[PDB]
Every structure is written in C-alpha cells, then in structure tokens.
Amino acid sequence: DLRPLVPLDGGRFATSDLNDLYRRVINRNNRLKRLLDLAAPDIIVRNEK
Amino acid sequence: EEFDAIKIALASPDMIRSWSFGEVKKPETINYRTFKPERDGLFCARIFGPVKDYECLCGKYKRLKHRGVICEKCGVEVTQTKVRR
Amino acid sequence: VDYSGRSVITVGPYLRLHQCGLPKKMALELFKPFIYGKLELRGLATTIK
Amino acid sequence: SQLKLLVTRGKEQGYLTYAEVNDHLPEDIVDSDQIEDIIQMINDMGIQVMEEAPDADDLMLAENTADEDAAEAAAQVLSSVESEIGRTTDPVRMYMREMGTVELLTREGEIDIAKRIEDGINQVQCSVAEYPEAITYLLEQYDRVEAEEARLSDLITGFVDPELAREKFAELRAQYVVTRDTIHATAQEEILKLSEVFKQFRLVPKQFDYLVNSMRVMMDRVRTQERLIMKLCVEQCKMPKKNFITLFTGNETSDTWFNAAIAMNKPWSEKLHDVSEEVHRALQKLQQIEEETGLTIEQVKDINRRMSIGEAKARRAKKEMVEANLRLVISIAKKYTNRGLQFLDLIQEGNIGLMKAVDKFEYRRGYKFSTYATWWIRQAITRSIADQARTIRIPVHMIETINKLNRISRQMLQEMGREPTPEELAERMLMPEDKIRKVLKIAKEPISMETPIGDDEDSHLGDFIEDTTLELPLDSATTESLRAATHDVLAGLTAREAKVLRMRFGIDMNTDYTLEEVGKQFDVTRERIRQIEAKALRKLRHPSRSEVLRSFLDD
Amino acid sequence: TPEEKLLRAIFGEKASDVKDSSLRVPNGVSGTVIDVQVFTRDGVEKDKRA
Ligand SMILES: [Zn+2]
C-alpha cells in the first residue's frame, strides 16, 4: 500500500512505479534461478547476473 | 509510544527475514478478471495481509471474532487492512 | 492541514486591531465539530446526524 | 594530466561548460556513456554545474557545498580512469563485447559439434545400460505403471503403442534376470546382450535425471566412504599417499589391505589402531555397495568416469554451439524492441530458447541448424513477451485475441475510411459483441502514478487519488454515540433480558451466537429464547423508550 | 455491525444493496438549470427523457 495499484474509473489502473521495478527484479531473479537449473554456458549466466 | 532516539545501521540478512512476511516469488500483481491479488506476486493476501478489513481472500472467515485465524484454504491472516501497510 | 481555508482579504477599518473579520460561511465550515458539540450539548439535536 | 587541469579550472573558475570538459577530456573514448559517467563524476566532484550557460545571478546566487572527502575520491577516479584504460559501461554492451570473442561461424562444423554431443550421450548411454539400478528402476516403474499407479507413456518417451513397450519390458526383464542369474561364467556375454537390447530405447529427460541422480548419490556414497577410508588413514595417521595407495588400488574390496596393513610394522600402522574400526566400517559400506550392485568399486569409478567425461564433452559442445549462435539470437531478438520489455530480457529469453533448440536437434533429418533454432528462439521470445510483459498479467490466448483485434483494427481503419466500431469488429471478428467490449477494456496498460500532472505548482497524478475506504470521522462519532445509546437502552432492561439480547446479537462480545448456545446457557434451547427475544424487541419498540434509537435512523 | 444490528432488528429497516452516488450540485451555487444533454452507448435502451 505504499506503491498501490488503484482502480481508476474505466478499468484503467494507475499504479506506482515500484511495482514495475520489483516486477523486473523478480523476473530476473527467477530467470537466473532457471538458468542455474539448466547450467547454461558461462556467457549466459554472466549476462544474467 | 514515546520511544527514544532513532537508530540506523546496516540491514543484516536474518534481520531482513525477521522483517518478512513470506517470500515474494512471482511477478504477477492482480488477476485481470477478478481484481483480487494473485498469490504471490508483488501483492498478495497471505504475505502482506488481507484486502478487506477482517475478511479472508477466498471468504471462509468474515467476522471480528475470527481475527487471527489464518484461513486453511488461502492462509490469509484475517486482520485489519491497515496491516497491508 | 484540515481546519483551514482562504479568501480575498479586504480593508475593514471598523475593527480594533485584535480582531480580524471573517465570513459567516467560512466560520460555519471551519467550526463544524465545535458546532456539533455545542448542539448536542444544548439538546437542539439529540443525535449528531 | 590535462583533465586534472580541467579539475583545477573547475575548482577556480567556479564552473565549467560542455565545451570546456569536451576540450580537456582524454581522446579516443567518445562513447558518450563514459562521457556521461565522467560528467556525473565532475558534478560529484567540487564542480557543481555542469553548465551550458556560464551564469547565473541573484537567482540562486553564490551557491556552494563543501562536500569534503568526496573531492579526493572523485579526482582520484578521474586520474585513474584516464591513465589506465577506458572502461566499458552498461551491460548490453558488456554482453556484446564479451560474445564478440566468439568465432562466429560453424559452416558444417555443426556436424562435428553434434558429433561430440552424440559422443557424450552415447558414453552416458553405455553408462545407462551398465548401471544396474537403471534396469531395476525400469522394471519397478513398469510394475508400478501397469497396476495403474503411473503411466507407460509418462516413463519412457518412445523407442527409436504401450503394449509393444510392455512386451519389450518383459524382454529386457528376462535379459536382466538372466544377466543376474549366473553368479561369473558368461557375465560379459550377459551384459553384452543387455546393452544391445537396451541401446535403442529411450526415456523422459526427467526419468533420465532420476537415473543420473540415483547414480550421483551412489557416487556420493562411494566418495564419502573413500573419505572415511583415506581421510581417516592418511590424514589421521601419517599414512601418506604412496603407502596408502599401495594397498588402496586394484582390488579395493577386502578389509585385508587395511587391517593386515595395520600389522606391517610401520608408523602409519602404529597410528591407524583407533581408526581401525572407522575404516573397517568404510570398507564394510563399500562391500555392502558391492552387495548392492555386483561390480567392483573400481569398475564403479571407471563407469562413472566415462559417464562424466561424456557429459563434459556434451556440455562443452553445447557451450561452443551456443557461443556461436548468440549472434543469431541477437539478430532475431532485435525485432521486438518495444513490445514492453528490455533488449537484454529478449536476448536472455532467446538464450534459453537456443539452449532448448540445441537440446532438441538432430542431423538425421538434414536440417540447417541456424534456421532450425530461429524458430525456437522466436517462439520462446514470443512466449516471454506475452507472459511477462503486461503489468497485470493476461493469458496467452487473450494476447492472441488482442493482436487479432489490432490487425483487424488497422485493416478496417483504412478500409472503412474513418474507423471501426465494436459492432463492426464483432462481424469482422466473429466474437459475441460483448467479449469485444471486455477485451478492449482489458488490454490497456496502467498509467504511471508518478505521471506529472504539470497543471499546478508541481504535482503528480498520484497526489490526487483520494482514499475511499476510510470511515468518516462523522461516521465514527455516530458509531460511538450509538453504542452509548443502545448500551443505556439495554441497561434499561432486566439482567436476563439484556444477557439474552446481547447474546443473540453480536453486541459487546465476539461473533454472535445461535439458539443452540442460547439454550445451552439458559437451559432451554426452545421457545423461552424466542419469547424473551421477541418480547424484548416489542418492549424496546416502545416509543418513549426507543425514540432516540429511531432518531439514529438515517432515513 | 453490533448494536446497529440491534437497531435493524428493532425497526426492521432493510439496508438495500443500492448505493446513492447521484450528482448533487457543488455547494455554494444557486442557478437555473438551462439545458440537459444525455449520451448513450448504443447497447442501452434509451430511457424516457433521452
Ligand atoms: Zn481462505
């Protein structure tokens, strides 16, 4: 609730930006975990980190 | 709440777990059809508390007497909604 | 800040210097809680509504 | 050094300019990212401009901040960045430069790379056919599957109808049992038949992972037991490598080369006396592993070594091919640079897709690996751009519907001339005329709540979205007043009256009860409760007793 | 809530599911409504006044 996702009138939502940034970071963390399970070549894991 | 001096220092990891209420894991936020929050993304119910005051997510428990009990179906600690904050 | 307002200031020479003029309507909008207390005190309205 | 002269001029003159800094800078870098970094450093330095215009008057006049202990580090960073080399900035360019050290062609050298890959898979396949618990696992899965606790088509992913597979399961069952029922006259022939009857089958990759994980656990057991042997003999008794491997090699099964070695009249033999039982346990687990499998621990090591070497060769071929095809991935991923996602995220999705393509390629259909993997790359990046691009996540079929609507909207918006209506889209598209409303409601992004609503002093859209769920202070005062009123009213009853009328409601207690509990309290789960409740309701309906309550009526 | 519910019981006043959100004139103005215009998405049965 410090970075809400308020329902604006019309279905359009007016969210803060931290939702966007955390979404990016959670994506990249999950993707790095997924790369590690496969054990990709080191260029891949390096670019991911 | 007349506390004291305020204090600042590094954010030790296990401290950051004591601050926690459950690991965020997924990038979803809401559900695009019912605008309840998907579990568990940036938002949640079981992590960061209930949406509506004293009302579960799935809706099993909806009375003031049931405050504190976490619903067995979606683990949402039925409490106030300012605990979402 | 709740309990505030504003307006166009004006001249008003009929005042001692320890009293600013003020509209009836800004007054009755700033002092609603005070009014409500006094009105439930003098029994002119049994309930606050 | 001259950039240090820029530093001293910025110190004295009190500012700089784009022309000044661009004059003094070290030549030959000019990427404009290093430039932006160095300009931010000079800002973080004593200089606080960076300028364009020289001045500046009474408008914020005579400004300065000392900021000691930042100047000495900033000027240091300048003098170090100039003198040594020009450092790279950002990470897309990191990835470019780091993969540009890839020899960027395999014109039918893909055949050799796939050769190495087949080498790895086939060495590990010989490991498969040779690992006894592999065949026991297959037989156990067959029984579990036949009863109906699991499926046949879930275990093995086809040979080179599940009844064909099942008769083959019985065929290999007989092969393995005849291999096992000769305990040393024809054992090699037995393993030969087993390998040549099992080396045209196949399993699910996750079933093979389970095989390899039981194998890895076997290796972990043997390695822990060799720890229990050698780290307890050598590193506990001064029994060095030579004097330990003299008896640790070759046979490596019996307890004799440890126990009798204790009696060879040596210092290590005079130190192994209390580690005798521990190494005895070690060799006992080793011979129990023998009991388990049937093959010596040295054969265990040789088999897992061949497996590991094939695995390393295959992984290395995979690495080499993917390093090659990173360029292909970049080229194909450039085509989505504003879908709602980053260039690097696109190319990383492509990396994953290219890895899957490598893992599912064969030359036995004569493909060209470049155009083969192009499909996998584009499909994986499409799946990603659908799944994890929108803020609120919409499903895949929904994204397909949305792009259909956009294609048809463009077609109509230059066919019909002006633009199409939903009633016209519901007949170019063939949707139910209401799904189109819901689709074109849903498929739009959210607005950034830090959007600048610059129509004010300086504001933001976020500062204008009021709170809806807060209870008015008027409401809270009314609630408290009503509590007081109804409390005095209920006090204006009897003890039994007030108790029943609190209990059957939720007044001044927890959640409200049932007539079952009302009766469990007042002895009568019966009309006594109804009498009291309805009669007290009638009693409080009395004007001159509930007039204040009905004045609490917001009508 | 509590005793509000006791009120509901005593008086039988049924709180509808309906919520008043009508457009009420901004406080302070006293004019003559000179003209009303109505718009309608073409999926709603136009009312009487439209
Ligand atoms: Zn629940």
mmCIF file of all heavy atoms in Angstrom, chain D residues 184-218:
data_model
loop_
_atom_site.group_PDB
_atom_site.id
_atom_site.type_symbol
_atom_site.label_atom_id
_atom_site.label_comp_id
_atom_site.label_asym_id
_atom_site.label_seq_id
_atom_site.Cartn_x
_atom_site.Cartn_y
_atom_site.Cartn_z
ATOM 1 N N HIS D 184 29.751 -66.009 -12.865
ATOM 2 C CA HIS D 184 30.925 -65.340 -13.411
ATOM 3 C C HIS D 184 31.416 -66.130 -14.614
ATOM 4 O O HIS D 184 32.577 -66.027 -15.012
ATOM 5 C CB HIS D 184 32.022 -65.219 -12.352
ATOM 6 C CG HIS D 184 33.090 -64.223 -12.691
ATOM 7 N ND1 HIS D 184 34.270 -64.130 -11.987
ATOM 8 C CD2 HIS D 184 33.145 -63.264 -13.644
ATOM 9 C CE1 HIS D 184 35.010 -63.160 -12.495
ATOM 10 N NE2 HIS D 184 34.350 -62.620 -13.503
ATOM 11 N N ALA D 185 30.516 -66.929 -15.190
ATOM 12 C CA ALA D 185 30.849 -67.822 -16.292
ATOM 13 C C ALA D 185 30.599 -67.179 -17.650
ATOM 14 O O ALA D 185 31.354 -67.409 -18.598
ATOM 15 C CB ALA D 185 30.053 -69.125 -16.170
ATOM 16 N N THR D 186 29.548 -66.373 -17.759
ATOM 17 C CA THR D 186 29.148 -65.762 -19.019
ATOM 18 C C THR D 186 28.675 -64.328 -18.780
ATOM 19 O O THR D 186 27.815 -63.801 -19.494
ATOM 20 C CB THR D 186 28.075 -66.616 -19.695
ATOM 21 O OG1 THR D 186 28.529 -67.973 -19.748
ATOM 22 C CG2 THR D 186 27.830 -66.171 -21.125
ATOM 23 N N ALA D 187 29.257 -63.672 -17.772
ATOM 24 C CA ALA D 187 28.775 -62.362 -17.339
ATOM 25 C C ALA D 187 28.965 -61.303 -18.420
ATOM 26 O O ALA D 187 28.106 -60.430 -18.609
ATOM 27 C CB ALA D 187 29.484 -61.953 -16.048
ATOM 28 N N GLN D 188 30.094 -61.352 -19.134
ATOM 29 C CA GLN D 188 30.335 -60.379 -20.193
ATOM 30 C C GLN D 188 29.334 -60.541 -21.329
ATOM 31 O O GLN D 188 28.801 -59.550 -21.838
ATOM 32 C CB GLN D 188 31.763 -60.511 -20.711
ATOM 33 C CG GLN D 188 32.801 -60.115 -19.693
ATOM 34 C CD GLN D 188 32.691 -58.660 -19.306
ATOM 35 O OE1 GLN D 188 32.297 -58.332 -18.190
ATOM 36 N NE2 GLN D 188 33.033 -57.777 -20.234
ATOM 37 N N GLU D 189 29.067 -61.785 -21.738
ATOM 38 C CA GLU D 189 28.052 -62.038 -22.759
ATOM 39 C C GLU D 189 26.693 -61.529 -22.306
ATOM 40 O O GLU D 189 25.919 -60.979 -23.101
ATOM 41 C CB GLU D 189 27.965 -63.535 -23.052
ATOM 42 C CG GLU D 189 29.214 -64.158 -23.643
ATOM 43 C CD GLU D 189 30.255 -64.461 -22.591
ATOM 44 O OE1 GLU D 189 30.005 -64.149 -21.409
ATOM 45 O OE2 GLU D 189 31.316 -65.012 -22.939
ATOM 46 N N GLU D 190 26.390 -61.717 -21.022
ATOM 47 C CA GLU D 190 25.122 -61.267 -20.467
ATOM 48 C C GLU D 190 24.987 -59.756 -20.558
ATOM 49 O O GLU D 190 23.960 -59.240 -21.019
ATOM 50 C CB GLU D 190 25.032 -61.739 -19.024
ATOM 51 C CG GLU D 190 25.053 -63.239 -18.934
ATOM 52 C CD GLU D 190 25.324 -63.733 -17.544
ATOM 53 O OE1 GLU D 190 25.544 -62.902 -16.639
ATOM 54 O OE2 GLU D 190 25.362 -64.963 -17.361
ATOM 55 N N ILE D 191 26.017 -59.031 -20.120
ATOM 56 C CA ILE D 191 25.980 -57.576 -20.208
ATOM 57 C C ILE D 191 25.945 -57.128 -21.661
ATOM 58 O O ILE D 191 25.326 -56.110 -21.984
ATOM 59 C CB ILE D 191 27.169 -56.954 -19.449
ATOM 60 C CG1 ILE D 191 27.089 -57.293 -17.958
ATOM 61 C CG2 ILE D 191 27.194 -55.444 -19.654
ATOM 62 C CD1 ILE D 191 28.326 -56.927 -17.177
ATOM 63 N N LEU D 192 26.582 -57.882 -22.562
ATOM 64 C CA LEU D 192 26.540 -57.546 -23.983
ATOM 65 C C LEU D 192 25.113 -57.613 -24.515
ATOM 66 O O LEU D 192 24.640 -56.685 -25.186
ATOM 67 C CB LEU D 192 27.449 -58.492 -24.774
ATOM 68 C CG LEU D 192 28.964 -58.435 -24.561
ATOM 69 C CD1 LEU D 192 29.655 -59.546 -25.341
ATOM 70 C CD2 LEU D 192 29.529 -57.078 -24.956
ATOM 71 N N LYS D 193 24.421 -58.717 -24.231
ATOM 72 C CA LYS D 193 23.031 -58.857 -24.658
ATOM 73 C C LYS D 193 22.160 -57.778 -24.035
ATOM 74 O O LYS D 193 21.294 -57.204 -24.706
ATOM 75 C CB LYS D 193 22.491 -60.235 -24.292
ATOM 76 C CG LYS D 193 23.134 -61.388 -25.018
ATOM 77 C CD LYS D 193 22.420 -62.687 -24.680
ATOM 78 C CE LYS D 193 23.058 -63.382 -23.485
ATOM 79 N NZ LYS D 193 22.717 -62.673 -22.219
ATOM 80 N N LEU D 194 22.380 -57.483 -22.754
ATOM 81 C CA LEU D 194 21.581 -56.464 -22.080
ATOM 82 C C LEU D 194 21.778 -55.102 -22.730
ATOM 83 O O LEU D 194 20.811 -54.383 -23.013
ATOM 84 C CB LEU D 194 21.952 -56.417 -20.599
ATOM 85 C CG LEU D 194 21.161 -55.462 -19.718
ATOM 86 C CD1 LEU D 194 19.713 -55.869 -19.724
ATOM 87 C CD2 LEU D 194 21.722 -55.500 -18.314
ATOM 88 N N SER D 195 23.032 -54.739 -22.992
ATOM 89 C CA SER D 195 23.314 -53.452 -23.604
ATOM 90 C C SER D 195 22.726 -53.376 -25.003
ATOM 91 O O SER D 195 22.153 -52.351 -25.386
ATOM 92 C CB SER D 195 24.824 -53.214 -23.632
ATOM 93 O OG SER D 195 25.356 -53.162 -22.317
ATOM 94 N N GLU D 196 22.841 -54.455 -25.781
ATOM 95 C CA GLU D 196 22.380 -54.400 -27.160
ATOM 96 C C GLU D 196 20.876 -54.593 -27.287
ATOM 97 O O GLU D 196 20.329 -54.391 -28.377
ATOM 98 C CB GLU D 196 23.122 -55.434 -28.005
ATOM 99 C CG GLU D 196 24.615 -55.148 -28.120
ATOM 100 C CD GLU D 196 24.900 -53.804 -28.770
ATOM 101 O OE1 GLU D 196 24.088 -53.357 -29.607
ATOM 102 O OE2 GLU D 196 25.938 -53.194 -28.440
ATOM 103 N N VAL D 197 20.199 -54.993 -26.207
ATOM 104 C CA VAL D 197 18.740 -54.951 -26.191
ATOM 105 C C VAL D 197 18.200 -53.666 -25.580
ATOM 106 O O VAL D 197 17.023 -53.336 -25.797
ATOM 107 C CB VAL D 197 18.160 -56.159 -25.432
ATOM 108 C CG1 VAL D 197 18.572 -57.448 -26.112
ATOM 109 C CG2 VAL D 197 18.613 -56.143 -23.985
ATOM 110 N N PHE D 198 19.012 -52.932 -24.822
ATOM 111 C CA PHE D 198 18.550 -51.692 -24.216
ATOM 112 C C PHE D 198 19.018 -50.440 -24.954
ATOM 113 O O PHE D 198 18.501 -49.354 -24.682
ATOM 114 C CB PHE D 198 19.008 -51.635 -22.755
ATOM 115 C CG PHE D 198 18.391 -50.524 -21.971
ATOM 116 C CD1 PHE D 198 17.097 -50.633 -21.509
ATOM 117 C CD2 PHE D 198 19.094 -49.362 -21.713
ATOM 118 C CE1 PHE D 198 16.516 -49.615 -20.792
ATOM 119 C CE2 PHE D 198 18.517 -48.335 -20.999
ATOM 120 C CZ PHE D 198 17.223 -48.463 -20.538
ATOM 121 N N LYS D 199 19.954 -50.555 -25.896
ATOM 122 C CA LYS D 199 20.520 -49.381 -26.552
ATOM 123 C C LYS D 199 19.777 -48.963 -27.821
ATOM 124 O O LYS D 199 20.406 -48.450 -28.757
ATOM 125 C CB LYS D 199 21.997 -49.603 -26.872
ATOM 126 C CG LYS D 199 22.939 -49.492 -25.695
ATOM 127 C CD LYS D 199 24.351 -49.730 -26.185
ATOM 128 C CE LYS D 199 24.755 -48.615 -27.135
ATOM 129 N NZ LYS D 199 26.154 -48.748 -27.603
ATOM 130 N N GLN D 200 18.465 -49.185 -27.899
ATOM 131 C CA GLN D 200 17.670 -48.459 -28.882
ATOM 132 C C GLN D 200 16.360 -47.977 -28.272
ATOM 133 O O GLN D 200 15.419 -47.661 -29.009
ATOM 134 C CB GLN D 200 17.404 -49.298 -30.141
ATOM 135 C CG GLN D 200 18.653 -49.542 -30.987
ATOM 136 C CD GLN D 200 18.363 -50.270 -32.290
ATOM 137 O OE1 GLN D 200 17.225 -50.649 -32.561
ATOM 138 N NE2 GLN D 200 19.397 -50.463 -33.105
ATOM 139 N N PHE D 201 16.289 -47.896 -26.943
ATOM 140 C CA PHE D 201 15.123 -47.423 -26.218
ATOM 141 C C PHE D 201 15.326 -45.941 -25.912
ATOM 142 O O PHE D 201 16.256 -45.305 -26.416
ATOM 143 C CB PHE D 201 14.893 -48.206 -24.915
ATOM 144 C CG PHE D 201 14.567 -49.678 -25.088
ATOM 145 C CD1 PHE D 201 14.472 -50.278 -26.336
ATOM 146 C CD2 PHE D 201 14.276 -50.447 -23.969
ATOM 147 C CE1 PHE D 201 14.153 -51.624 -26.457
ATOM 148 C CE2 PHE D 201 13.949 -51.791 -24.085
ATOM 149 C CZ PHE D 201 13.889 -52.380 -25.330
ATOM 150 N N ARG D 202 14.462 -45.380 -25.069
ATOM 151 C CA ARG D 202 14.655 -44.010 -24.609
ATOM 152 C C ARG D 202 13.679 -43.737 -23.473
ATOM 153 O O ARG D 202 12.707 -44.473 -23.291
ATOM 154 C CB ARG D 202 14.457 -43.008 -25.752
ATOM 155 C CG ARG D 202 14.917 -41.592 -25.449
ATOM 156 C CD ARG D 202 14.702 -40.692 -26.659
ATOM 157 N NE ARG D 202 13.284 -40.440 -26.907
ATOM 158 C CZ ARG D 202 12.802 -39.871 -28.008
ATOM 159 N NH1 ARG D 202 13.617 -39.501 -28.985
ATOM 160 N NH2 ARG D 202 11.496 -39.684 -28.135
ATOM 161 N N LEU D 203 13.953 -42.682 -22.706
ATOM 162 C CA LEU D 203 13.131 -42.303 -21.563
ATOM 163 C C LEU D 203 12.826 -40.812 -21.619
ATOM 164 O O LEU D 203 13.286 -40.089 -22.506
ATOM 165 C CB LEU D 203 13.822 -42.638 -20.237
ATOM 166 C CG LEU D 203 13.784 -44.070 -19.723
ATOM 167 C CD1 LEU D 203 14.661 -44.978 -20.566
ATOM 168 C CD2 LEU D 203 14.229 -44.083 -18.273
ATOM 169 N N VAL D 204 12.037 -40.355 -20.650
ATOM 170 C CA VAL D 204 11.805 -38.930 -20.437
ATOM 171 C C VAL D 204 13.107 -38.341 -19.909
ATOM 172 O O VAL D 204 13.855 -39.036 -19.204
ATOM 173 C CB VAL D 204 10.636 -38.685 -19.466
ATOM 174 C CG1 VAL D 204 10.516 -37.213 -19.123
ATOM 175 C CG2 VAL D 204 9.332 -39.180 -20.064
ATOM 176 N N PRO D 205 13.434 -37.091 -20.245
ATOM 177 C CA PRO D 205 14.650 -36.484 -19.686
ATOM 178 C C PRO D 205 14.636 -36.437 -18.177
ATOM 179 O O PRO D 205 15.691 -36.571 -17.551
ATOM 180 C CB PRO D 205 14.652 -35.076 -20.295
ATOM 181 C CG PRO D 205 13.831 -35.196 -21.524
ATOM 182 C CD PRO D 205 12.761 -36.192 -21.195
ATOM 183 N N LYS D 206 13.465 -36.287 -17.566
ATOM 184 C CA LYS D 206 13.389 -36.270 -16.112
ATOM 185 C C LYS D 206 13.525 -37.668 -15.519
ATOM 186 O O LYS D 206 14.101 -37.824 -14.439
ATOM 187 C CB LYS D 206 12.090 -35.595 -15.684
ATOM 188 C CG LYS D 206 12.117 -34.099 -15.961
ATOM 189 C CD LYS D 206 10.812 -33.415 -15.610
ATOM 190 C CE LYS D 206 9.983 -33.141 -16.860
ATOM 191 N NZ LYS D 206 9.367 -34.368 -17.434
ATOM 192 N N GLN D 207 13.070 -38.701 -16.224
ATOM 193 C CA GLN D 207 13.394 -40.051 -15.783
ATOM 194 C C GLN D 207 14.891 -40.307 -15.876
ATOM 195 O O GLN D 207 15.478 -40.942 -14.988
ATOM 196 C CB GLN D 207 12.615 -41.078 -16.597
ATOM 197 C CG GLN D 207 11.124 -40.955 -16.398
ATOM 198 C CD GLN D 207 10.734 -41.168 -14.952
ATOM 199 O OE1 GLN D 207 11.280 -42.038 -14.271
ATOM 200 N NE2 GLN D 207 9.800 -40.361 -14.468
ATOM 201 N N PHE D 208 15.533 -39.807 -16.934
ATOM 202 C CA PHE D 208 16.982 -39.947 -17.019
ATOM 203 C C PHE D 208 17.686 -39.144 -15.936
ATOM 204 O O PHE D 208 18.724 -39.574 -15.428
ATOM 205 C CB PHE D 208 17.490 -39.518 -18.387
ATOM 206 C CG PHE D 208 18.972 -39.627 -18.526
ATOM 207 C CD1 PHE D 208 19.574 -40.859 -18.692
ATOM 208 C CD2 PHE D 208 19.769 -38.499 -18.473
ATOM 209 C CE1 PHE D 208 20.948 -40.964 -18.821
ATOM 210 C CE2 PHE D 208 21.148 -38.597 -18.600
ATOM 211 C CZ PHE D 208 21.737 -39.834 -18.774
ATOM 212 N N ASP D 209 17.144 -37.978 -15.581
ATOM 213 C CA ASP D 209 17.683 -37.219 -14.458
ATOM 214 C C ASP D 209 17.541 -37.989 -13.156
ATOM 215 O O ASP D 209 18.437 -37.951 -12.313
ATOM 216 C CB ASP D 209 16.996 -35.861 -14.346
ATOM 217 C CG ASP D 209 17.502 -34.872 -15.363
ATOM 218 O OD1 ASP D 209 18.693 -34.956 -15.725
ATOM 219 O OD2 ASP D 209 16.709 -34.011 -15.801
ATOM 220 N N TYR D 210 16.425 -38.692 -12.970
ATOM 221 C CA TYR D 210 16.288 -39.505 -11.765
ATOM 222 C C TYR D 210 17.309 -40.636 -11.755
ATOM 223 O O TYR D 210 17.904 -40.937 -10.711
ATOM 224 C CB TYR D 210 14.878 -40.075 -11.648
ATOM 225 C CG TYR D 210 14.627 -40.750 -10.311
ATOM 226 C CD1 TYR D 210 14.261 -40.009 -9.191
ATOM 227 C CD2 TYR D 210 14.805 -42.116 -10.157
ATOM 228 C CE1 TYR D 210 14.045 -40.619 -7.971
ATOM 229 C CE2 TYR D 210 14.593 -42.730 -8.942
ATOM 230 C CZ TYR D 210 14.212 -41.978 -7.854
ATOM 231 O OH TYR D 210 14.004 -42.593 -6.642
ATOM 232 N N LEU D 211 17.499 -41.290 -12.903
ATOM 233 C CA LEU D 211 18.556 -42.292 -13.031
ATOM 234 C C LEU D 211 19.909 -41.708 -12.647
ATOM 235 O O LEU D 211 20.634 -42.269 -11.818
ATOM 236 C CB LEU D 211 18.611 -42.826 -14.462
ATOM 237 C CG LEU D 211 17.483 -43.706 -14.996
ATOM 238 C CD1 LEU D 211 17.691 -43.964 -16.478
ATOM 239 C CD2 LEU D 211 17.423 -45.015 -14.236
ATOM 240 N N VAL D 212 20.251 -40.565 -13.239
ATOM 241 C CA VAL D 212 21.545 -39.940 -13.003
ATOM 242 C C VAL D 212 21.656 -39.444 -11.575
ATOM 243 O O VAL D 212 22.751 -39.386 -11.027
ATOM 244 C CB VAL D 212 21.777 -38.799 -14.006
ATOM 245 C CG1 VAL D 212 23.064 -38.069 -13.690
ATOM 246 C CG2 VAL D 212 21.814 -39.347 -15.415
ATOM 247 N N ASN D 213 20.540 -39.103 -10.933
ATOM 248 C CA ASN D 213 20.606 -38.624 -9.558
ATOM 249 C C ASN D 213 20.788 -39.765 -8.573
ATOM 250 O O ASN D 213 21.546 -39.633 -7.608
ATOM 251 C CB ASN D 213 19.360 -37.820 -9.227
ATOM 252 C CG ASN D 213 19.360 -36.480 -9.903
ATOM 253 O OD1 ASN D 213 20.384 -35.798 -9.956
ATOM 254 N ND2 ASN D 213 18.214 -36.092 -10.439
ATOM 255 N N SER D 214 20.129 -40.896 -8.804
ATOM 256 C CA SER D 214 20.475 -42.086 -8.036
ATOM 257 C C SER D 214 21.932 -42.485 -8.291
ATOM 258 O O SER D 214 22.644 -42.903 -7.370
ATOM 259 C CB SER D 214 19.511 -43.226 -8.369
ATOM 260 O OG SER D 214 19.791 -44.379 -7.590
ATOM 261 N N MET D 215 22.407 -42.303 -9.524
ATOM 262 C CA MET D 215 23.815 -42.549 -9.823
ATOM 263 C C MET D 215 24.727 -41.590 -9.063
ATOM 264 O O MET D 215 25.758 -41.997 -8.514
ATOM 265 C CB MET D 215 24.053 -42.406 -11.325
ATOM 266 C CG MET D 215 23.367 -43.436 -12.216
ATOM 267 S SD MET D 215 23.766 -43.115 -13.955
ATOM 268 C CE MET D 215 22.850 -44.398 -14.805
ATOM 269 N N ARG D 216 24.386 -40.304 -9.061
ATOM 270 C CA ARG D 216 25.181 -39.310 -8.356
ATOM 271 C C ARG D 216 25.180 -39.588 -6.861
ATOM 272 O O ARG D 216 26.185 -39.376 -6.181
ATOM 273 C CB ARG D 216 24.640 -37.908 -8.639
ATOM 274 C CG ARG D 216 24.738 -37.449 -10.078
ATOM 275 C CD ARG D 216 24.099 -36.073 -10.218
ATOM 276 N NE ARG D 216 23.941 -35.622 -11.604
ATOM 277 C CZ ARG D 216 24.807 -34.857 -12.262
ATOM 278 N NH1 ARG D 216 25.917 -34.439 -11.671
ATOM 279 N NH2 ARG D 216 24.561 -34.504 -13.514
ATOM 280 N N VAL D 217 24.061 -40.080 -6.332
ATOM 281 C CA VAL D 217 24.003 -40.429 -4.918
ATOM 282 C C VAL D 217 24.875 -41.645 -4.634
ATOM 283 O O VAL D 217 25.525 -41.724 -3.588
ATOM 284 C CB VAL D 217 22.544 -40.658 -4.490
ATOM 285 C CG1 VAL D 217 22.487 -41.186 -3.074
ATOM 286 C CG2 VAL D 217 21.760 -39.364 -4.602
ATOM 287 N N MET D 218 24.893 -42.615 -5.550
ATOM 288 C CA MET D 218 25.836 -43.727 -5.447
ATOM 289 C C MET D 218 27.269 -43.216 -5.397
ATOM 290 O O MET D 218 28.084 -43.662 -4.577
ATOM 291 C CB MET D 218 25.656 -44.669 -6.639
ATOM 292 C CG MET D 218 26.498 -45.940 -6.602
ATOM 293 S SD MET D 218 25.944 -47.119 -5.361
ATOM 294 C CE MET D 218 24.447 -47.725 -6.139
#
